Amino acid sequence: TYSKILYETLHGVARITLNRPERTNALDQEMLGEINAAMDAAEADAGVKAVIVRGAGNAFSSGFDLKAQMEARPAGVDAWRPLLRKDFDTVMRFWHCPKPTIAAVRGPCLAGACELALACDMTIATEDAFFGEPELKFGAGIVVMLLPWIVGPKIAKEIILLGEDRVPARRAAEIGMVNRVVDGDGLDAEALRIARHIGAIDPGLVKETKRALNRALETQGMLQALESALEIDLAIEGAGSPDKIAFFEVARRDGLRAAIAWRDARFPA
Template sequence: MTELVLYEQIDAVAVISLNRPQRLNAMNRGMLEELNQAANRAEQDKTVHAVVLTGAGTAFSSGFDLKAQAENTPQGIDEWRPVLRRNFDACMSFWHLAKPTVAAVHGPALAGACELAMACDIKISDETGIFGEPEFDLARDCSYVLPWMVGPNEQKKSSYSGWTTSPQARLRRWD
């Protein structure tokens, strides 16, 4: 793996870190591919019993790298399908991991990064954590994990209003 995703094993725990701190760990194509590889590595390693997913620097992740996307925007369904599949697969690799997964959030976990955190079994955050799906403000409801977390009615409220929230507020709504 390159340095877009760091993989470290501490005792029986694999620590996977998003590593683009200069871009608030904005996820690009390479990072998504490396996330999949890291999840698969943890899954296959019999000495790993749990996985912690976190971000380097001051953020978990600001979401997908919109600057990179704008520089090479897919055109039509044939170009969009592999992009969406890669995004989905990276998130679902943590959802389907047979070992316990923990999202250790600090700073923003927005859009696709919020989905990634929600795909983990346990979500923890320090007081700087901000969870949100700001793309909902653009009438783009692409959340595939949120309905499982909060139920369809709460998901619709979030989709129609757009939201960012603190960990304390999320705890009141998710528990």
């Protein structure tokens, strides 16, 4: 029934596949809506004990869809507010989910998709996976500022302020963004083992224990800090950074590859 994702249940586990292989599984408006529908279904289904999220093929996702943004040309605070609200709330579904969520990453896991994975209870990745938040290089702000809650301040500042977007899975594991790096041929099997392990436990026990774990960070004010960063991003995008305006000016004229080249030329080699 879905157009931009796949939804499966197997072995008491739900599996969501971000499914737009020709756009590196970029998260557009439609896909975000379907993710919410799938999470609703997984949460309502007593036969589902855990949720795996992955991308189609050998990419997780490059993040929120910039080609769709180029075409839509949202302008001003009131246009941006609902876009960012949906981005933020969809990502946070994976944190708030009463059932444990596992991100299983191949290839790129960037920007909004990096945030989606950050929100999951666990993240596993292949050696070839790479992570980061390139937003500022595009002239975009950060929608869901989970990074400093997961990896701590110095590393979060480096990744976000420089727009690091090639952080290897091994490094992501060192800093606490990734739980396990696995063999490429074994990613789906490892995610399923973890999910089925969770599925063997009394669901109430898992639910209450996750509640207690999440409470540790919520006690620190994480949800207020996240809402504050989202508010800041609304001001950023509602105004429109000249960096983003210039990026899409090049993109509409010469194409997105040319815009990326233009972007990369502004920064050191």
